[PDB]
Amino acid sequence: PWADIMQGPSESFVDFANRLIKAVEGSDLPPSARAPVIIDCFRQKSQPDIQQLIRTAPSTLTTPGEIIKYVLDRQKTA
Amino acid sequence: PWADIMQGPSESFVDFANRLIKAVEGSDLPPSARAPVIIDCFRQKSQPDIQQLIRTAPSTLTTPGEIIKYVLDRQKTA
Amino acid sequence: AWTPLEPKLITRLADTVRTKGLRSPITMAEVEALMSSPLLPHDVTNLMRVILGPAPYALWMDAWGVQLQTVIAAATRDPRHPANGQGRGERTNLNRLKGLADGMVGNPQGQAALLRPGELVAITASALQAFREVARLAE
Amino acid sequence: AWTPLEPKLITRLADTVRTKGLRSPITMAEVEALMSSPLLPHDVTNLMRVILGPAPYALWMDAWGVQLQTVIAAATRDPRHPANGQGRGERTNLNRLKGLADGMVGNPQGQAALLRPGELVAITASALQAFREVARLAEPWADIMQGPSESFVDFANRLIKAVEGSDLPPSARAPVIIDCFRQKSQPDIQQLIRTAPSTLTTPGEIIKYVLDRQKTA
Amino acid sequence: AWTPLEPKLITRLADTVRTKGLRSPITMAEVEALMSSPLLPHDVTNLMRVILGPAPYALWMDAWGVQLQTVIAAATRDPRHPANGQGRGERTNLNRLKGLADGMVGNPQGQAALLRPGELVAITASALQAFREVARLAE
Amino acid sequence: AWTPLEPKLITRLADTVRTKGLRSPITMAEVEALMSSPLLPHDVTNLMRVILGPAPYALWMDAWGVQLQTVIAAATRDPRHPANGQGRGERTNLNRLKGLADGMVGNPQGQAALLRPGELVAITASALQAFREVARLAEPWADIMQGPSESFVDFANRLIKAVEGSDLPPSARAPVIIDCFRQKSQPDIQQLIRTAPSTLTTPGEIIKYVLDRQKTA
Amino acid sequence: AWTPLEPKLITRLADTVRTKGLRSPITMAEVEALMSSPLLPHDVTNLMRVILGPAPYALWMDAWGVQLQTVIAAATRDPRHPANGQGRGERTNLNRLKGLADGMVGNPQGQAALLRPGELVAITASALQAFREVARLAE
Amino acid sequence: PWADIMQGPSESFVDFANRLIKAVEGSDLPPSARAPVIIDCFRQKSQPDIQQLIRTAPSTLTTPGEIIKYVLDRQKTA
Amino acid sequence: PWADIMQGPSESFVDFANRLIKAVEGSDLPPSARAPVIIDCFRQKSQPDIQQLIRTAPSTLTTPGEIIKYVLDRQKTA
Amino acid sequence: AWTPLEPKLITRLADTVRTKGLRSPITMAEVEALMSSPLLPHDVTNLMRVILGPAPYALWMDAWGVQLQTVIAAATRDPRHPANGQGRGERTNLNRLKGLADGMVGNPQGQAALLRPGELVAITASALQAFREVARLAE
């Protein structure tokens, strides 16, 4: 179930994005509703450090690929 | 007095913007000097979290409405 | 002939926006109610000046301009717009939509004189969509 | 006539990407191998769908679009593009490059029919550059020190790996590797390189010299 | 027309170099096997990039350059080199041997177009001798 | 007619070299100032004899000879040198450049008589480059870390100093300074630079950003 | 003919910047004094290299580039710039302003030869504005 | 006196070279005998670490400037 | 036996070279194989100080006499 | 006609070199004595083979070659060398100086036949200088 996917405390972001995109594209949603759902799940899941990282984006991110690129650039190396 | 308006530690940003725009438009300034003053007061007042949020704007904000929209988008939900 | 909206209805709508907010379905219903007859740019501009605060009013001016620009792009994409005419001399400029054209600036009577009913309904629909955008954005 | 790539080769390449990663030189060599003949947008799209995960695939779609847009800007900047023609009726739109044009959406046969060989090679080079970008993005040289117990060949391997797999220009890797050999590589080897009667102007020469005169221990 | 070497053979050769080392007679036999057809500078360069580590690859680049320079000295010492021509306009520069000449940098197709078979076999023999030197040097 | 340089200016320059050193930018600016008009070999030789100590003077004589030899190789590689002439009888020998030719040894007047303006400017540029070499030689960036208690502007000053006063090419200093800001500069500032919503592509921009958003303490 | 600035004046200005700081009105007056005659890019570059520390010098290089870019935008917006000419062959590129053009890199004499007086005064005003920005930014 | 100059245990090499070249050039030697004397004094003075550093020079150093450059390159940083 | 000759810990280098050249020239090797053997025995015998001294030779030594001269020049006086 | 040096004198000189060393003034005087008449390459080579040990003999071969090369450079720098002739057909190659030329290898009689007196004295002076160098180098 896509709506139950959370980014674990120790999980990296690319694994979380892979799992989420997999569960959203392999589901019962229409094809035209996958990108907005993936974006809004990146924003509300993806534990509050990345949540604030996406929130304070000086540019407007309108695509899952752009969000992934931005987060991978500005992520907290740890 | 517009030049004495600060955003309180607990005040939201829309209330501060309302108060500031009210005091600036209901003052003795010429009509052509209100927008630059409102912008430069958004930048120097509006306690340092929002100050840094406006400073690190990848786009150039040249209107009080655009600044308000940007800050409302990327504000720290709390 | 131009007739202004009642300040009593405008005061009631302003208090509705003040207590219920911008996004409540009752507020949108009230706005649709006061958006029933096609309004002149003067009417909608003063209405939004009164019911909205300063910052929402700035946002609404921006959104209204953007929506009117989309309308004018569709109008130059189709010469059969109810605001347009058949010849090129009736093409509608944004100065005529925003009430900035000649013979209209600050004068609602002249505004009502030169404007088309299609112009009025397009302006009204644009203002309603802009209000919806700003309401979704403010909260 | 369109012929698909072997699913056996694609499965082997997918397992290579799965074990070695996206950035290994063997993986890039394998991709160059399967990128030998000019592929149709359908082929490259399905290939990246199979070998890449979901998030790298999104990144790759983005990068491929950007590179194709740069190509189309260069094409409108020069009417002699091998994808273009002489008249204005042969100008190539991004719908024709991404396979979105009329008569191409979902049909590889029609795709192969209408596409030009210059179009195919441009699409292929764009996809290769996009793959390189995403591989460099999906996965620090100035923090590398030679450990007290580490040998010198291991330190050199680690340093050259981290310097060549980084964001430096190609013309800045050798001087950086040399100056990192000189300042890292704990003070015994530092003094060994400092007191070199000859001038060492290449990482290979420095490695050879140090391996010759190193303190056997 | 340029055809790349199989990544399966290259992977097997890389694992051979990884387990047996650089100097084992089986490894040299395998290299001689994959060095059978005359390779373009692109092929040999990528092959050594994949099978050799970073430091042996640097050493091999050095040794390959030195051996190619000896070849070019012998070529300017004899105008009948299978890489050279009869006139002075076919003299082969090191930019053409290392693949750095015009129309060759990064493009294997153009490389295969402009290169001579004598050029290819000379490059190949030079690369083999350089590999032997580096293997004798590494261990 | 030959006019000597003022001993007052030479004394001031000598004291500048004595207090600031050979490599300070103020010293190089002063040398460029006193290197404005084309000097005769006698002038530059006596100038370096006075301002430099014995060992730096020996080093400078060596470097000046090497640079003049490179100049003479370029001159025999091009008969259109402003020091050369069109015929072979105007070819310039190193005895004429170093002031050792006939009619010049020890006599500045005869020197100024026979020398060409192109000869003078070539000698002057050679001497300036030799001075730069010796200054870089007479007195490690990859070992610089920001201390736990050190401020960021001090760390940036130290790092930029050590990177610009090193053996790197001029086109490799900015990327190295950036990548050293990112990997050194203890993990608080590392994370501050990492989470930059904008892309910082210049050391000045990175310094400005960090100074804006730094943790006041 | 190029004449360098006195190292005595430069030393005094450097000590002024060292004791009074970058933002004092006396320091800005001294900079305006040493910014009186139109300087070549070499002069201003070496001056800022000597009087400013490493980090302020980086900031100043950035700011100078930005201001010169604004100048070049205004120049392409008006073909009557005192740095420009009437034909298109006199258009001034940033390589010519920053001293990076052909015949100018590292040579102040050639610089003074090819540069225009309008070019010099524009470079000088740009450098002064950049110094003001960096001084306001540093403290 | 030039023949009494030794490099002190704590003295740097450039100071020793300066002192030695000063005392040799400001002495009663002919001009054609200063360079060989300076070289042979670099080799026999200049305490045994630098003595061995000059001795094991793969190249032949035939000038005081070249010796100074070599020693400054390969000296023991301390 | 030439292949059993080592330079003793206290032995000088000229004595070791004399002994080695004697044993190599007074042996059963062909005349054309004595110089390479003498060189390679200088390199592998001749205890590791001289081994490293010969290894770090900026020039290529291709004759026993040249190796002997180089080592005698740069040897550690003791 | 070639006459060999007395083995008695050679034995006495060898014992002198054995007891006094290579650098004693008495040893150099004795060498000058046995270096009085111009010797053929065979004579000097065998003399140094007998009086010098193996390692000094290698050093002496090196030094003799270097000095002979300097002599041949001076000879190609002056066509009036007592070893040279006027035409180009008498130019003296190092094979003729070291005794390696045709008709000379191993045969002292043929050597004495083809060699010039200037050749002999040049070879002798070269050998003496080489002996001096090696003696100064050995101890």
Swiss-Prot record, chains C, E, G, J:
Domain of life of the organism encoding this protein: Viruses
Region of interest (Involved in capsid protein dimerization), residue spans: 42-50, 103-114
Protein's cellular compartments: Virion
Function: Self-associates to form the irregular polyhedron core composed of hexamers and pentamers, that encapsulates the genomic RNA-nucleocapsid complex. Assembles as a tube in vitro. Binds to inositol hexakisphosphate (IP6), which allows the assembly of the polyhedral capsid.
Subunit structure: Homodimer. Homomultimer. Homohexamer.
UniProt name for this protein: Capsid protein p27, alternate cleaved 1
Annotated source species: Rous sarcoma virus subgroup C (strain Prague)
Range covered out of full length: 249 to 387 of 701
From Swiss-Prot, chains D, F:
Coiled coil: none
Marked site positions, Involved in capsid protein dimerization upon acidification: 167, 179
Residue span of region Involved in capsid protein dimerization: 42-50, 103-114
Subcellular location: Virion
Role played: Self-associates to form the irregular polyhedron core composed of hexamers and pentamers, that encapsulates the genomic RNA-nucleocapsid complex. Assembles as a tube in vitro. Binds to inositol hexakisphosphate (IP6), which allows the assembly of the polyhedral capsid.
Assembly, per entry: Homodimer. Homomultimer. Homohexamer.
Protein name per its UniProtKB record: Capsid protein p27, alternate cleaved 1
Record organism: Rous sarcoma virus subgroup C (strain Prague) (RSV-Pr-C)
